[PDB]
Design a protein around this ligand. Sequence first.
Ligand SMILES: O=C(O)c1ccc(Cl)cc1
Length: 126
Amino acid sequence: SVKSEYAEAAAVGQEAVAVFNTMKAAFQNGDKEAVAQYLARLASLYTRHEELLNRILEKARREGNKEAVTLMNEFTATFQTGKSIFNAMVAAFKNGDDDSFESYLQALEKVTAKGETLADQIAKAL
Ligand SMILES: O=C(O)c1ccc(Cl)cc1
């Protein structure tokens, strides 16, 4: 159901957290080769999560689930903010700008955490 599809989306989000934290570690340690591979992994995760999120949103819409639609619209907007910062980070990595990479790493953390207390409102609304 929409709810099993949400637990699958939540698990991909958790896969991103795990990989992001091992990417941050590699960045701090200077292992650019690893960072490069982690950024590719995280790109695919974002893409996969965004597709699971769109299917959940469209499903909630077809189901007339107004509250779920409101919360999903708010969550995906925030999700997109994190994606846009991620893309800026990838660009900082290609350009050799470590000052910006570190900054984006931090802002992407704060934007992802903020979107968490809502993630547990969607779950109960679907
Ligand atoms: O899909 C997510 O939740 C997600 C994906 C990628 C990053 Cl870097 C951070 C969060």
